[PDB]
Amino acid sequence: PSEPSNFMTLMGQNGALLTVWALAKRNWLWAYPNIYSQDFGNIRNWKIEPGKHREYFRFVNQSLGTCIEAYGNGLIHDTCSLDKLAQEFELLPTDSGAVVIKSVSQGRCVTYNPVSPTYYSTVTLSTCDGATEPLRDQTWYLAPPVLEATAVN
Amino acid sequence: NLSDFKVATWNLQGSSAVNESKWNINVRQLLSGEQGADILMVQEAGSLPSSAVRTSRVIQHGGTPIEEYTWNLGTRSRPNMVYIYYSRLDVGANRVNLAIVSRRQADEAFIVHSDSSVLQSRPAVGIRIGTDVFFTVHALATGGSDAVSLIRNIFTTFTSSPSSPERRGYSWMVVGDFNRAPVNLEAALRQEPAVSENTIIIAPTEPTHRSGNILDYAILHDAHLPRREQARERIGASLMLNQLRSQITSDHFPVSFVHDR
Amino acid sequence: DPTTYPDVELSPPPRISLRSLLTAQPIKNDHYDSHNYLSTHWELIDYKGKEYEKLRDGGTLVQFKVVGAAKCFAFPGEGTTDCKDIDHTVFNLIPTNTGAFLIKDALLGFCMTSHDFDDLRLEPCGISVSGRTFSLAYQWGILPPFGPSKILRP
């Protein structure tokens, strides 16, 4: 199809995908690998669009149509609004090809714990230092969405 | 008009060891989706995708090579086409080649030389769709010192000394690896007011290369904007990371130029 | 190499981590301690040979080379083997509508799949995959090399 190409997943170094857990708006976002969230469906896929401002972006949920928003020390998803700065992020390149997601409104980066005694990572916002530790990592991969793929060869 | 197109640029950094995979991994991604580029300039393109097919159209009336090819991004049954205007400049190693991928066929193709394009440097390769002209360039690695002669020569060819009245009404966009910082190129162009007042440099503020430098961007002239008012242009530049689903296979990051929403 | 433009320095192959999209598990090499992140790094190099054309199926033949050694990923890979052993080290990248990749072995035209953690197999996927759609088990992501990285500042 032609719509799938519009979605992707933000995968942490642990394979954990930034996702909506609680479908209701304004609830925190978490990170679950596909292997442990198969029943989550497309709430794990996002569409990256240009923000209100030039080099900024916003993330629109494939299934819910909601946007990621910097809120407090973490991320939530709420109704999309181009005038909400908290919904605009910078995708900073790194020397490995991975990206660091920075909140324009906060100036802090999307942090997570690659290592967990549970099947999910907690997502927070903190000083952008490009840390890559077992319990604190700030690098993500812009990867394919978790959807069935059609060969176009 | 230029702002009607989603233009993008990527220095593929091709080579004999890795070239085809870069096309199918990154280039394919830059051209897909709702935000896929309408026109994508490719530098150091090496070889074109092995599935690309040369058309019978002869668009090369000069000495520098320029050919048209079609490339099916989809299946035979359900095609998804784009045109490729390829200029195989690297006769020695066939890796430092220029190309422009377009969803739409070019009405005309151009090659514009600088003071050294016949000595050691590379010329600007471009195409025309209606009244908009798009050029891809790869300036010299040592400070892109040929950039000013390249921009100046395109300016005189279409804007100040056109060979036909229509050309003055054409808008043009020079996109690619300038191998120098936007502010550095901007300073140099200001030495020539006529060129400088009829153009507007559009570049990202994020690095476009692994060294952290900003080297890939665009410079344009909107024929519907007055002299000294090109800055009114509603086109913004930014890294095109929103299009990736894989590792970027070169040290250069793709850059997009799109109309301000 | 003998380029017409020596001002343009040759670029080395790209560094990647090959992950199954189902388990998100990276394919590892046997050159480094499995505790070393370098064990998840590969160099993507295109295969220039022509002995696999009949089954190429429109894909791009490649090899995943160990960083700094003449060894490549091989399928029943305890680890890696001689890059010269093409029959076992040459793979085939097949593009999709999502950015994911289907990966077949050049020799048999079989699809590499992973159905669960530490599960890796080569199974027949038909004569051609064009236009057919597959589940995550068949999908691979060619992503940035796992490990540390520094934010690029302008």
Coordinates of C-alpha atoms in Angstrom, one line a residue:
Chain A
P1 CA 0.0 0.0 0.0
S2 CA 0.9 3.7 0.0
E3 CA 0.0 4.7 3.6
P4 CA 2.3 2.3 5.5
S5 CA 5.4 4.1 4.2
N6 CA 4.1 7.1 6.2
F7 CA 4.7 5.3 9.5
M8 CA 7.7 4.2 11.5
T9 CA 8.8 3.2 15.0
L10 CA 11.3 5.0 17.3
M11 CA 13.4 2.0 18.5
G12 CA 15.7 2.3 21.5
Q13 CA 19.0 0.5 21.7
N14 CA 17.2 -2.3 23.5
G15 CA 14.7 -2.8 20.7
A16 CA 12.0 -1.0 22.8
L17 CA 9.6 1.1 20.7
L18 CA 8.2 4.4 22.0
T19 CA 4.5 3.7 22.3
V20 CA 1.2 4.8 23.7
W21 CA 0.2 2.4 26.6
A22 CA -3.0 3.9 28.0
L23 CA -5.1 4.9 25.0
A24 CA -6.7 7.8 26.9
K25 CA -5.2 11.2 26.1
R26 CA -2.6 12.8 28.4
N27 CA -1.3 9.5 29.7
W28 CA 2.4 8.8 29.8
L29 CA 4.2 7.1 26.9
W30 CA 6.4 4.0 27.5
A31 CA 8.7 1.8 25.5
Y32 CA 7.9 -1.9 24.7
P33 CA 9.7 -4.2 22.3
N34 CA 7.5 -5.6 19.6
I35 CA 8.0 -9.2 20.9
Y36 CA 6.2 -8.1 24.2
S37 CA 3.6 -5.8 22.8
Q38 CA 2.2 -7.7 19.8
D39 CA -1.4 -7.0 21.0
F40 CA -0.7 -3.2 21.1
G41 CA -1.2 -2.8 17.4
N42 CA -0.6 0.4 15.6
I43 CA -0.5 2.6 18.6
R44 CA 3.2 1.8 18.4
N45 CA 3.6 3.3 15.0
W46 CA 4.1 7.1 14.4
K47 CA 4.1 9.5 11.5
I48 CA 6.8 12.3 11.7
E49 CA 5.6 15.6 10.3
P50 CA 7.1 19.0 10.2
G51 CA 6.3 21.1 13.2
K52 CA 4.9 24.6 13.2
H53 CA 8.5 25.8 13.1
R54 CA 11.0 25.0 10.3
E55 CA 13.4 22.4 11.6
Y56 CA 11.1 20.9 14.2
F57 CA 8.9 17.8 14.0
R58 CA 5.9 16.3 15.8
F59 CA 4.8 12.7 16.0
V60 CA 1.4 11.6 15.1
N61 CA 0.1 8.3 16.3
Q62 CA -0.9 5.9 13.5
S63 CA -3.9 4.4 15.4
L64 CA -5.1 7.2 17.7
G65 CA -4.2 10.4 15.7
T66 CA -2.7 11.9 18.9
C67 CA 0.6 13.6 19.1
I68 CA 3.6 13.1 21.4
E69 CA 3.9 16.0 23.9
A70 CA 6.7 16.9 26.3
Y71 CA 5.0 17.0 29.7
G72 CA 6.8 17.2 33.1
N73 CA 9.7 14.7 33.2
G74 CA 8.2 12.4 30.6
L75 CA 6.1 12.3 27.4
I76 CA 2.3 12.0 27.1
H77 CA 0.1 12.0 24.0
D78 CA -2.6 14.6 23.5
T79 CA -4.8 16.2 20.8
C80 CA -2.6 17.6 18.0
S81 CA -2.2 21.4 18.0
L82 CA 0.4 23.2 15.9
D83 CA 0.4 26.0 18.4
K84 CA 1.5 23.7 21.3
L85 CA 5.3 24.1 21.4
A86 CA 5.5 21.2 23.8
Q87 CA 4.5 19.0 20.8
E88 CA 7.6 20.0 18.7
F89 CA 10.9 18.1 18.8
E90 CA 14.3 18.2 17.3
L91 CA 15.8 15.1 15.8
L92 CA 19.6 15.6 16.5
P93 CA 22.0 13.5 14.5
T94 CA 24.7 11.6 16.2
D95 CA 28.0 10.2 14.9
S96 CA 26.6 6.7 14.8
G97 CA 23.5 7.4 12.8
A98 CA 21.1 7.2 15.7
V99 CA 19.2 10.2 16.9
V100 CA 18.6 12.0 20.1
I101 CA 15.1 13.4 20.5
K102 CA 15.0 16.9 22.0
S103 CA 12.0 18.7 23.3
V104 CA 11.8 22.2 21.9
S105 CA 9.7 23.5 24.8
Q106 CA 11.9 21.9 27.4
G107 CA 15.3 21.6 25.9
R108 CA 15.6 18.2 27.4
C109 CA 16.0 14.8 25.6
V110 CA 14.0 11.7 25.5
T111 CA 15.8 9.3 28.0
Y112 CA 15.1 5.7 28.7
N113 CA 16.5 2.6 30.5
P114 CA 17.8 0.0 28.0
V115 CA 18.0 -2.4 30.9
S116 CA 14.8 -3.4 32.8
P117 CA 13.6 -6.2 35.2
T118 CA 10.4 -5.8 33.3
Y119 CA 9.5 -6.0 29.6
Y120 CA 9.3 -2.2 29.2
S121 CA 11.4 0.9 29.5
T122 CA 10.3 4.0 31.4
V123 CA 10.5 7.2 29.2
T124 CA 11.6 10.5 30.8
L125 CA 13.1 13.8 29.8
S126 CA 16.5 15.0 31.0
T127 CA 19.8 16.9 30.2
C128 CA 20.9 16.1 26.7
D129 CA 24.2 14.4 27.1
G130 CA 23.9 11.6 24.6
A131 CA 24.4 9.1 27.4
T132 CA 24.3 5.4 26.5
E133 CA 24.3 3.5 29.8
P134 CA 22.4 0.3 30.9
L135 CA 19.9 2.4 32.9
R136 CA 20.1 5.7 31.1
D137 CA 20.2 6.0 27.3
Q138 CA 19.2 8.8 25.0
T139 CA 19.7 7.3 21.5
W140 CA 16.9 6.0 19.3
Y141 CA 16.8 4.5 15.8
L142 CA 14.4 5.7 13.1
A143 CA 13.2 2.3 12.1
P144 CA 10.4 0.6 10.0
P145 CA 6.9 0.6 11.6
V146 CA 5.7 -2.6 13.1
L147 CA 3.4 -3.6 10.2
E148 CA 3.2 -6.3 7.6
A149 CA 5.5 -5.3 4.7
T150 CA 5.0 -5.8 1.0
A151 CA 8.0 -6.6 -1.2
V152 CA 8.3 -4.0 -4.0
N153 CA 11.1 -5.7 -5.9
Chain B
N1 CA 7.0 27.6 -8.7
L2 CA 9.9 26.3 -6.5
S3 CA 7.8 26.3 -3.4
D4 CA 5.4 23.9 -5.2
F5 CA 8.1 21.2 -5.0
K6 CA 9.5 19.1 -2.2
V7 CA 13.2 19.2 -3.0
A8 CA 15.9 17.2 -1.3
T9 CA 19.6 16.6 -1.5
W10 CA 21.9 13.7 -0.5
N11 CA 25.6 13.0 -1.1
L12 CA 25.4 9.3 -1.5
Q13 CA 29.3 9.0 -1.3
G14 CA 29.1 6.0 -3.6
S15 CA 32.0 3.8 -4.6
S16 CA 32.7 0.5 -6.2
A17 CA 32.5 -1.3 -2.9
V18 CA 29.1 0.1 -1.8
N19 CA 26.8 1.9 -4.2
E20 CA 23.7 -0.1 -5.1
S21 CA 22.7 -0.8 -1.5
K22 CA 22.7 3.0 -0.8
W23 CA 20.2 3.6 -3.6
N24 CA 17.8 0.9 -2.4
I25 CA 18.2 1.6 1.3
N26 CA 18.3 5.4 1.6
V27 CA 17.3 6.9 -1.8
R28 CA 14.2 4.8 -2.0
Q29 CA 13.2 6.1 1.4
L30 CA 13.8 9.8 0.5
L31 CA 11.4 9.4 -2.4
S32 CA 8.6 7.6 -0.6
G33 CA 5.6 8.5 1.5
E34 CA 3.5 11.7 1.6
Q35 CA 6.7 13.7 2.3
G36 CA 8.8 12.0 -0.4
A37 CA 10.8 14.4 -2.6
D38 CA 9.5 15.6 -5.9
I39 CA 13.1 16.2 -6.9
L40 CA 16.1 14.7 -5.3
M41 CA 19.7 15.8 -6.1
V42 CA 22.3 13.1 -5.7
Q43 CA 26.0 13.7 -5.5
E44 CA 28.7 11.0 -5.8
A45 CA 26.0 8.8 -7.2
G46 CA 28.4 6.2 -8.6
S47 CA 26.2 3.9 -10.7
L48 CA 22.5 4.2 -11.1
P49 CA 20.3 1.4 -9.7
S50 CA 20.9 -1.6 -11.9
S51 CA 17.2 -1.7 -12.7
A52 CA 17.2 1.8 -14.1
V53 CA 16.6 2.0 -17.9
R54 CA 18.0 4.6 -20.3
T55 CA 15.3 6.2 -22.5
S56 CA 15.8 7.0 -26.2
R57 CA 15.6 10.7 -25.4
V58 CA 18.7 12.6 -26.3
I59 CA 19.2 15.6 -24.0
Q60 CA 22.9 16.0 -24.5
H61 CA 23.8 18.6 -27.0
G62 CA 27.1 19.5 -25.4
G63 CA 30.3 17.7 -24.4
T64 CA 29.5 17.0 -20.7
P65 CA 27.3 13.8 -20.5
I66 CA 23.7 14.0 -19.4
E67 CA 21.2 11.1 -19.9
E68 CA 17.6 10.4 -18.9
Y69 CA 16.6 7.1 -17.3
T70 CA 13.4 5.8 -15.7
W71 CA 13.5 3.8 -12.5
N72 CA 10.6 1.7 -11.2
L73 CA 10.4 1.9 -7.4
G74 CA 7.5 -0.5 -7.4
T75 CA 6.6 -3.8 -9.0
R76 CA 6.0 -4.5 -12.7
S77 CA 2.3 -4.9 -12.1
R78 CA 2.0 -1.9 -9.8
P79 CA 4.7 0.6 -10.9
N80 CA 6.0 3.6 -9.0
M81 CA 8.1 5.6 -11.4
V82 CA 10.7 8.4 -11.3
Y83 CA 13.1 9.8 -13.9
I84 CA 16.8 10.1 -13.4
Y85 CA 18.9 12.6 -15.1
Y86 CA 22.4 11.2 -14.8
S87 CA 25.7 12.9 -15.6
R88 CA 28.6 10.3 -15.4
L89 CA 31.5 12.7 -14.8
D90 CA 33.8 10.2 -13.1
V91 CA 35.2 8.4 -16.1
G92 CA 38.2 7.4 -14.0
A93 CA 36.4 5.6 -11.2
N94 CA 32.7 6.2 -11.9
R95 CA 31.9 7.2 -8.4
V96 CA 31.8 11.0 -8.3
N97 CA 28.8 11.3 -10.6
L98 CA 25.8 13.7 -10.3
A99 CA 22.1 12.8 -10.7
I100 CA 18.7 14.3 -10.2
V101 CA 15.7 12.0 -9.5
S102 CA 12.4 13.4 -10.5
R103 CA 8.8 12.1 -10.3
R104 CA 8.1 14.3 -13.3
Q105 CA 9.8 14.3 -16.7
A106 CA 12.1 17.3 -17.4
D107 CA 11.0 19.7 -20.1
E108 CA 14.7 20.4 -20.7
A109 CA 18.1 19.6 -19.2
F110 CA 21.0 21.9 -18.6
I111 CA 24.8 21.8 -17.8
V112 CA 26.3 25.0 -16.5
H113 CA 30.0 25.4 -16.2
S114 CA 32.1 27.6 -13.7
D115 CA 35.6 28.9 -14.5
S116 CA 37.1 25.5 -13.7
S117 CA 34.5 22.9 -14.7
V118 CA 36.6 22.0 -17.8
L119 CA 39.8 22.0 -15.8
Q120 CA 39.3 19.9 -12.6
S121 CA 36.0 20.8 -11.0
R122 CA 32.4 19.7 -11.6
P123 CA 29.7 21.6 -13.5
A124 CA 26.1 22.2 -12.4
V125 CA 23.6 19.6 -13.8
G126 CA 20.0 20.7 -14.0
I127 CA 16.5 20.2 -15.4
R128 CA 13.6 22.3 -16.1
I129 CA 10.0 21.5 -15.2
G130 CA 7.8 24.4 -16.6
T131 CA 9.2 27.7 -15.4
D132 CA 11.3 26.2 -12.5
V133 CA 14.9 25.1 -12.9
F134 CA 16.6 22.7 -10.5
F135 CA 20.4 22.2 -10.3
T136 CA 22.5 19.8 -8.4
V137 CA 26.2 20.7 -7.6
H138 CA 29.2 19.2 -5.8
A139 CA 31.7 22.0 -5.1
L140 CA 35.4 21.4 -4.6
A141 CA 36.2 19.6 -1.4
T142 CA 38.7 22.3 -0.4
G143 CA 36.3 25.0 0.7
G144 CA 34.0 24.7 -2.3
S145 CA 35.9 27.6 -3.9
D146 CA 34.1 27.1 -7.2
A147 CA 30.6 27.7 -5.7
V148 CA 30.6 31.5 -6.5
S149 CA 31.5 31.0 -10.1
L150 CA 28.9 28.3 -10.4
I151 CA 26.0 30.4 -8.9
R152 CA 27.1 33.5 -10.9
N153 CA 27.2 31.6 -14.2
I154 CA 23.7 30.1 -13.6
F155 CA 22.5 33.6 -12.7
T156 CA 23.8 35.1 -15.9
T157 CA 22.5 32.2 -17.9
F158 CA 18.9 32.6 -16.8
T159 CA 18.5 35.9 -15.1
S160 CA 20.8 38.7 -16.2
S161 CA 21.9 37.6 -19.7
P162 CA 19.3 35.1 -20.9
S163 CA 19.4 34.1 -24.6
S164 CA 15.5 34.2 -24.6
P165 CA 13.0 36.4 -22.8
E166 CA 11.3 33.4 -21.1
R167 CA 14.4 32.5 -19.1
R168 CA 14.3 35.7 -17.1
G169 CA 10.9 34.5 -15.9
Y170 CA 12.3 31.1 -14.8
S171 CA 12.9 30.5 -11.1
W172 CA 16.0 28.4 -10.3
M173 CA 17.3 26.4 -7.4
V174 CA 20.9 25.2 -6.9
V175 CA 21.0 22.3 -4.4
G176 CA 23.8 20.2 -3.1
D177 CA 27.2 19.9 -1.4
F178 CA 28.7 23.4 -1.3
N179 CA 31.6 22.1 0.8
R180 CA 31.5 25.3 2.8
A181 CA 29.4 26.9 5.5
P182 CA 26.3 28.8 4.4
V183 CA 27.6 32.0 6.1
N184 CA 30.9 31.5 4.4
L185 CA 29.3 31.3 0.9
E186 CA 27.0 34.1 1.8
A187 CA 29.9 36.4 2.7
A188 CA 31.5 35.6 -0.7
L189 CA 28.4 36.3 -2.8
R190 CA 28.0 39.7 -1.1
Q191 CA 31.0 40.7 -3.1
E192 CA 28.6 40.7 -6.1
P193 CA 25.4 42.6 -5.3
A194 CA 23.6 41.6 -8.5
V195 CA 24.0 37.9 -7.7
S196 CA 23.5 38.4 -3.9
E197 CA 20.4 40.5 -4.1
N198 CA 18.7 38.1 -6.5
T199 CA 19.3 35.0 -4.4
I200 CA 18.5 33.6 -1.0
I201 CA 20.6 30.8 0.6
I202 CA 18.4 28.2 2.3
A203 CA 20.2 25.9 4.8
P204 CA 19.6 23.9 8.0
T205 CA 21.1 24.9 11.3
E206 CA 21.8 21.2 12.3
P207 CA 25.0 19.5 10.9
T208 CA 24.6 17.9 7.5
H209 CA 27.8 15.9 7.8
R210 CA 29.4 13.6 10.4
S211 CA 32.1 16.2 11.1
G212 CA 29.3 18.4 12.5
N213 CA 29.6 20.8 9.6
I214 CA 26.7 22.2 7.5
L215 CA 27.7 21.5 3.9
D216 CA 24.6 20.5 2.0
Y217 CA 22.0 23.2 1.3
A218 CA 20.4 25.3 -1.4
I219 CA 20.6 28.8 -3.0
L220 CA 17.8 30.1 -5.0
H221 CA 16.3 32.8 -7.1
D222 CA 12.5 33.3 -7.2
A223 CA 11.6 35.1 -10.4
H224 CA 8.4 36.4 -8.7
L225 CA 10.2 38.0 -5.8
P226 CA 11.9 41.4 -6.3
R227 CA 15.6 42.1 -6.1
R228 CA 16.6 42.4 -2.5
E229 CA 13.5 40.5 -1.4
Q230 CA 14.3 36.9 -2.0
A231 CA 14.3 36.4 1.8
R232 CA 10.5 36.6 1.6
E233 CA 10.7 33.1 0.2
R234 CA 8.5 30.6 2.1
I235 CA 10.8 27.7 1.7
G236 CA 12.7 26.3 4.6
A237 CA 15.5 23.8 4.8
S238 CA 16.0 21.0 7.3
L239 CA 17.5 17.5 7.7
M240 CA 15.1 15.0 6.2
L241 CA 15.5 12.4 9.0
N242 CA 11.7 12.1 9.0
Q243 CA 12.0 10.0 5.9
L244 CA 14.4 7.3 7.3
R245 CA 13.7 3.7 8.3
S246 CA 17.4 2.7 8.2
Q247 CA 20.9 3.7 9.0
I248 CA 22.0 6.6 6.7
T249 CA 24.6 4.9 4.5
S250 CA 26.8 7.9 4.0
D251 CA 28.5 10.6 6.2
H252 CA 26.1 13.1 4.7
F253 CA 22.6 13.6 6.0
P254 CA 19.7 14.1 3.5
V255 CA 18.4 17.7 3.5
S256 CA 14.9 18.8 2.4
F257 CA 13.6 22.1 1.2
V258 CA 9.8 22.6 1.5
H259 CA 7.2 25.3 1.6
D260 CA 6.5 26.7 5.1
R261 CA 3.1 25.1 6.1
Chain C
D1 CA 40.5 5.0 -6.5
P2 CA 41.5 6.2 -10.0
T3 CA 38.8 8.8 -9.8
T4 CA 38.6 11.8 -12.1
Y5 CA 38.2 13.9 -9.0
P6 CA 41.0 13.2 -6.4
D7 CA 39.8 16.1 -4.3
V8 CA 36.9 13.8 -3.3
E9 CA 38.3 11.2 -0.8
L10 CA 37.0 7.6 -1.0
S11 CA 34.5 6.7 1.7
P12 CA 34.7 3.5 3.7
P13 CA 31.7 1.1 3.9
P14 CA 28.8 2.0 6.1
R15 CA 28.6 0.6 9.7
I16 CA 25.2 -1.1 10.6
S17 CA 23.5 -3.5 13.1
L18 CA 21.2 -6.0 11.4
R19 CA 18.1 -6.5 13.6
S20 CA 15.1 -8.8 13.2
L21 CA 12.0 -6.6 13.4
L22 CA 10.2 -9.2 15.4
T23 CA 12.6 -9.7 18.2
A24 CA 14.7 -6.5 17.6
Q25 CA 17.7 -8.8 18.2
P26 CA 20.9 -7.8 16.4
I27 CA 22.8 -10.4 14.3
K28 CA 26.2 -10.9 16.1
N29 CA 29.6 -11.7 14.8
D30 CA 32.0 -14.1 16.6
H31 CA 35.0 -11.7 16.4
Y32 CA 34.3 -9.9 19.7
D33 CA 33.1 -10.9 23.1
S34 CA 29.4 -11.1 23.0
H35 CA 29.6 -8.5 25.8
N36 CA 31.4 -6.1 23.5
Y37 CA 29.0 -3.9 21.5
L38 CA 31.4 -4.3 18.5
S39 CA 29.9 -7.8 18.3
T40 CA 26.8 -6.3 16.8
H41 CA 28.6 -4.2 14.2
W42 CA 28.9 -5.1 10.5
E43 CA 30.1 -3.3 7.4
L44 CA 27.7 -3.3 4.5
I45 CA 29.4 -4.1 1.3
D46 CA 27.8 -4.9 -2.1
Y47 CA 28.6 -8.1 -3.8
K48 CA 29.8 -7.5 -7.4
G49 CA 29.7 -11.1 -8.6
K50 CA 27.4 -12.4 -11.2
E51 CA 26.9 -16.1 -10.2
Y52 CA 23.7 -15.4 -8.3
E53 CA 21.7 -13.6 -11.0
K54 CA 19.0 -16.3 -11.7
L55 CA 17.5 -16.0 -8.2
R56 CA 18.5 -12.4 -7.4
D57 CA 14.7 -11.6 -7.7
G58 CA 15.4 -7.8 -8.2
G59 CA 17.2 -7.6 -4.9
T60 CA 20.7 -6.2 -4.0
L61 CA 23.4 -8.7 -3.3
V62 CA 25.5 -7.8 -0.3
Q63 CA 27.7 -9.1 2.4
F64 CA 28.0 -8.2 6.1
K65 CA 31.7 -8.0 6.8
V66 CA 33.3 -8.0 10.2
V67 CA 34.8 -4.6 11.1
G68 CA 38.6 -4.9 10.4
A69 CA 38.8 -8.5 9.3
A70 CA 38.3 -10.6 6.1
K71 CA 35.3 -12.4 7.7
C72 CA 31.6 -12.2 6.9
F73 CA 28.4 -13.3 8.5
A74 CA 27.4 -16.8 7.3
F75 CA 24.2 -18.5 7.8
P76 CA 24.6 -21.4 9.9
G77 CA 26.8 -19.0 11.7
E78 CA 28.4 -20.1 14.9
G79 CA 30.2 -17.0 13.8
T80 CA 31.7 -15.8 10.6
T81 CA 33.5 -17.3 7.7
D82 CA 35.9 -16.3 4.8
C83 CA 34.4 -13.5 2.7
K84 CA 35.8 -15.6 -0.2
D85 CA 33.2 -18.2 0.6
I86 CA 30.4 -16.5 -1.4
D87 CA 28.0 -19.4 -1.4
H88 CA 27.5 -18.9 2.4
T89 CA 28.3 -15.2 2.9
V90 CA 26.4 -13.5 0.1
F91 CA 22.9 -12.2 0.9
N92 CA 20.1 -10.5 -1.0
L93 CA 18.3 -7.3 0.1
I94 CA 14.7 -7.0 -1.0
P95 CA 13.0 -3.6 -0.5
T96 CA 9.5 -3.2 1.0
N97 CA 6.9 -0.5 1.2
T98 CA 7.7 0.1 4.9
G99 CA 11.5 0.5 4.9
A100 CA 12.0 -3.0 6.3
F101 CA 14.0 -5.5 4.4
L102 CA 13.5 -9.1 3.4
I103 CA 16.8 -10.9 3.3
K104 CA 17.5 -13.9 1.2
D105 CA 20.6 -16.0 0.7
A106 CA 22.1 -15.5 -2.7
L107 CA 22.6 -19.2 -3.4
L108 CA 19.2 -20.7 -2.6
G109 CA 16.9 -17.7 -2.7
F110 CA 15.6 -18.7 0.7
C111 CA 14.3 -16.1 3.2
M112 CA 16.1 -15.5 6.4
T113 CA 13.7 -15.3 9.3
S114 CA 13.5 -15.1 13.1
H115 CA 10.5 -16.3 14.9
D116 CA 11.7 -15.8 18.5
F117 CA 14.7 -14.9 20.5
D118 CA 17.8 -16.6 19.3
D119 CA 15.8 -18.2 16.4
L120 CA 17.3 -17.8 13.0
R121 CA 16.4 -19.7 9.9
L122 CA 16.6 -20.0 6.1
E123 CA 13.3 -21.1 4.7
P124 CA 11.9 -21.3 1.2
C125 CA 9.7 -18.3 0.5
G126 CA 8.7 -19.2 -3.1
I127 CA 10.1 -18.3 -6.5
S128 CA 9.5 -14.6 -6.0
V129 CA 8.5 -12.3 -3.2
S130 CA 7.5 -9.2 -5.4
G131 CA 4.1 -7.8 -4.4
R132 CA 3.7 -10.3 -1.5
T133 CA 3.3 -9.1 2.1
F134 CA 5.1 -10.6 5.1
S135 CA 5.0 -10.6 8.9
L136 CA 7.7 -9.3 11.1
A137 CA 9.4 -12.7 11.2
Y138 CA 10.7 -12.1 7.7
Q139 CA 11.6 -8.4 8.3
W140 CA 15.0 -7.0 9.0
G141 CA 16.0 -3.4 9.9
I142 CA 19.4 -2.1 8.7
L143 CA 20.0 0.3 11.5
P144 CA 22.8 2.3 13.2
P145 CA 25.5 0.3 14.9
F146 CA 24.5 -0.6 18.5
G147 CA 26.6 1.1 21.1
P148 CA 27.8 4.6 22.1
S149 CA 27.5 7.7 20.0
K150 CA 28.0 11.4 20.2
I151 CA 25.6 14.2 19.4
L152 CA 26.9 16.1 16.3
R153 CA 27.2 19.8 17.1
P154 CA 27.5 22.4 14.3

